[model samples]
Target chain A: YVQSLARGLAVIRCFDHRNQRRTLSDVARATDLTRATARRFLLTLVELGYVATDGSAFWLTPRVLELGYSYLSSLSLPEVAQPHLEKLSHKVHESSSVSILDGADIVYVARVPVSRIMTVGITIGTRLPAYATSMGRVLLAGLPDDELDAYLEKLDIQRLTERTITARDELKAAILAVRADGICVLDQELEAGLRSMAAPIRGASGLTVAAVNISTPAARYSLEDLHSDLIPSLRVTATDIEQDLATVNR
Target chain B: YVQSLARGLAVIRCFDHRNQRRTLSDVARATDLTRATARRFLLTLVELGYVAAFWLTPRVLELGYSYLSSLSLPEVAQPHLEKLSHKVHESSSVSILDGADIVYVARVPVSRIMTVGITIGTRLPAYATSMGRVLLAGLPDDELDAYLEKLDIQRLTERTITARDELKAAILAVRADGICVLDQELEAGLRSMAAPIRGASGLTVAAVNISTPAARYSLEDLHSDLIPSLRVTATDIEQDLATVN
Candidate 1:
């Protein structure tokens, strides 16, 4: 396709959550572009007001949001799912969020937080390891078997907490169970004293497009509490979201 | 310097609030590029996951979050804006004047109050908007004159003040009053009141506004009730922002 456009976007993507601010050489190395080429793209982005620099390193500016606003305004998913997620949060008195699987991570798209439940604050675009999160497991389970196997092969499983399932065989079994049961629950796997339950959100095509979850402090709920009270409400909310998606997508 | 990269960004900008879904020809026409060139860029964007099947994908959200997280103003003002929206039951937004437009930096929308939707990074003409007027009032005398001299003020509605003299008077009145109340000037049925948010040096860096439907609140009620709430919220945000620095 357009190689120039591809290189420019590649430079833009080079700066992410991990690499928020990068020098020219850092960007060139990350994107595998020559330093001269990277500098040209960076200068162009700054002139366009999408990137700003303090002499040595460059970071993105708020004008970049306009690019995504087109998509967000067009897709009624976040807006439609917002009220439902709020209702779910009200019912459970916990934070509710929606995420979609991107590669090996689940990126949060919409969230209504009641209180800070994790050490790190989670917001609209926060990415969490798919193999560790309840929503991630639900989304991973939605992937086709071949894709899942590929993901498993390249997965670098890490033990974030004692409850984290790092073994490949066990992770595969957990995903299979989620696929069968249509629900996934994690107890302090991503962070200490954090537990969450998630269900897949389907679109008009009846395919799982995203996942929604309600998270709380581990001290606040038991497995029975999640199954008996939280799971039913979570499933209902997911269904309501699916219905809304169907109406909007139609 | 890279015309191709600039054209690529222009193609991305073609998809906005009004034109969210576009074909190759639509993008080409919008960006004034050849269909073949637009197709190449579109394919590149698709490969990068920014565009998929002629629609923008969620991957673009990372670019937005990157901007918001880096800017100290939005992060500092977000919680306060949320609290104000909840307290006043009206949409609250923070914007800085750029040229003759106000660029929205942080926003907590309570409901859809206007036909045109607004979000973070939305820009509106300064002369016709409440936040824009407050930001204009913050400019120095020479800069203000330059802005007035260059402003091609368009009358958006019947109530929009188009004449330079009257607009000057209105902006000066807002400066003297330290608040701006715009009644259905930008869009029909949209009534917004604004207060200036100051930086640590006491310079007005941005403006915060509370927008509501005209049917819900009269100008008298907005001045008497909403104005006080907005000023208090602006002050609280200013103090919190100073601490952030």
Candidate 2:
């Protein structure tokens, strides 16, 4: 459906990862565009101050952060979520994040980290496939029923790891169960060595507007520990955040 | 000419600063637009996730950052500038080292301390500005002469600073003097303190500046205290940043 070359350039621009500094060839492969076409767009970007190259691999700079920051700075949610996220990170000693559903992915807006590896690996602006993340599923569950049906219909529940729910019906039932219970836990769903649990953050309207989650490596905690210690902490943290957000605005 | 309606909307969007959230009416007055038009765009932005309501006031959201970060990340400048800028407290910057027209490549503005009107991708006239002067002063003599012959020096007042000849002499003097003072020239009430910063090979590639308001500090202290400290710090930052690159 996208015809404008500028729009295509914009989409390709979205793929920059802190760890995934791509070559011109790497960009062409990732975006499914030809190398010559990718090179032409990359060169145009360099001319516009939107891009800079080290004469070999190209990486994203903060000029783009200005554009994103310019927009995000206008939002209250990230600013409002910051202190709470920091508190969660401090108590849990793991990375905590608040991300919202954007198309088929989750874009991390507010993140506080307890580990350098987690901070470096997953950061603000990091995107994850929505179907596989605990936070994403909670957000998916919060959608209006009709919208939820549409998303579930469109989503591909491929096996991300050994524990990933690849069956469409099974995944839909899991989302519904989480919606009923108001909390969800996932064990090695997206990445093999990662485990996480999430709960929804309700807005003043009492709708689950966003989800907050904590991610830890499999080695860090047993599944039983996640259920007992992490869930209580997660629920308490969510209630505290909901209270803080309600106090500030409503 | 822009449509009055669209121009009003753009102006309102401009008030969507990173900090200092504003209301719809505040946007209306800022843009000199009717309250109705600003309201319409504000609503539109909110629906798109670009703007959101922060209590009674409207604020920008992260959806817009996704758009902007795409281009900047592709450019690959942030990793180098972010940490370096944080260390110096002074504005350590990288700009394209052009002969007469040096464009700002990146700027790490001093945050939470002094906020300025300047942001990334903001351009300045090369002939009169300090960043441009430091870049221009590095030019060869003949190339500098050709630049002087062709440049349009705007008479912005007596403190107007330069016409054509004065700019030529000043750039040459800067080449010898090794420092550039751009005080209240570009904008009548504005001031900047600047010096050249060298790359790894000791080649002066871009300029660094610690711009304080003219009223903030004496011009004497700027040259003696600020400039030397900025030069020393820039060297140290480049050394630290090399490990990351």
Candidate 3:
């Protein structure tokens, strides 16, 4: 309804992975605004410190997180997942994390460190590529067919390691496997020797609202060991967190 | 430049801790727009999925971090820290995150787990705080002085720094130091040091913060040992992302 408002958000929205930085004309065309109108909105955002410009290029800044902080802080998932993550980490003898998918990436809303090799670093608010992570694939598999299509469409992925699935169709197949099997064991695809397995945490309505995972070093756990030893506990933790998630969303 | 766009942002901004969910009239009054104008903006955001029926929605996060996905702060933070830690051990090497408070939008823990302090999604008062001050200092010298003039200083804690003049000077000192380690100005035992995580455009989009318990290591120990490690990590973070180069 507000023309200016729509155009303003459009300007920022037009810059994602495909177009990480945009020129004045690029933004104008992307958002369907005149250069005059696009430049005016762009400069205003720059003044407010939400959009960054180095004269020829413009990109959004992290300060935009403030726009979403109130929402993220208000969520019951972060609060509900904390204790569950700790318990899961203790039982699994590894660091466990809770994440929600945002676009094509998986953002960590909660994490638990039982002092592992990967301890301390993967703090909350950290994000990892959905294509390469256990939590990410689990969450992606939980998406509806059409919703998952949007993720595949916008994605232009690069390999993080030799094992990363760079092919779109292959990733889709892997995700479908995750849906059928109801768990994902990512073996060092994100980085060498760092293995993780994840299961979907469904909402009260049976839709997967988030994902819960356990990350371990490959030096200690083989792929077979991770599946046999930890997958059962991982599913139990997901269900445990989901119980409170249903309670809180009420 | 775009009055309607600003009015729309104000409509959403007007809702916060105090007014988590606002009525039509409350939003209209807060943004000083007519009910007609407010309704249009409200419906627009609601349609866009940023705002829900009675309140703001989590999908708003979709707007915030997609931009971060481009920056790859989380992806970038790992390899860098792995190099720093494998040799020994060491921390948010900080995304310039500010909102109602400095929200931990992006962070990479290195040396310790601040199990008691902040993790991601915790909000800290931007004034008279650790990572908060570094971000405020990064506010372009010209803007920081102007920003403090209108800032309604609050005594969050008895020890909270309330003097704008001191904060302004402290901010300038932070700019020169390229780092800051403040005492528990926000509260006791929340001591942390932070540095700017500049972008390719020379903007302070994020910060790298390393905090410790006041009782564990003396401030002298923090300054002597940890600060150097923090500065070096921060440099690598900036080097990874371009700045005023």
Candidates in order, TM-scores: namely 0.64, 0.45, 0.52
Writing each residue's lDDT as its tens digit, candidate 3 over B90-199 gives 34435444553676655444435553334444566677667777888778666777777668888876777778888788888887888888787766776778877777
The prediction achieving the highest DockQ against the true structure is 1
lDDT: which candidate is best? 1
Candidate 2 stretches greater than 4 Å from native? A3-7, A10-24, A34-250, B1-94, B98-101, B105-115, B241-245
Q: lDDT tens string, model 2, B1-245?
A: 11432342253336434434677777777777688865765665555333543222222222233333343321344444455456544454555444455555445656454544454444567877777887788776787788888877777644766567778778878777777878887776567756665555665666666565676668887777677766665565555535434
Q: Write the per-residue lDDT of candidate 2 for residues A140-194, one digit (tens) a residue.
A: 8988989988988898778778889988789889999899888888888888888
Off by over 4 Å in 3: A17-20, A32-66, A70-180, A183-199, A202-250, B66-75, B78-105, B108-127, B131-179, B195-207, B213-232, B242-245
DockQ-derived CAPRI band for the predicted complex in model 2 = incorrect
- Ten-residue segment with the worst summed lDDT in candidate 1 chain B? B109-118
Chain B of candidate 3 versus the native chain B: what TM-score? 0.64
List the DockQ of the predictions in order: 0.21, 0.06, 0.20
Model 1 segments beyond 4 Å from truth? A1-3, A13-22, A26-34, A47-49, A52-63, A68-74, A78-250, B112-117
**lDDT, residue A204, candidate 2:** 73
- Least well predicted 10-residue stretch by lDDT in candidate 2 chain A: A1-10
C-alpha lDDT values of all predictions:
0.83, 0.64, 0.74
Residue B152, model 2: Cα distance from true site in angstroms: 1.0
lDDT of 1 at A246: 62
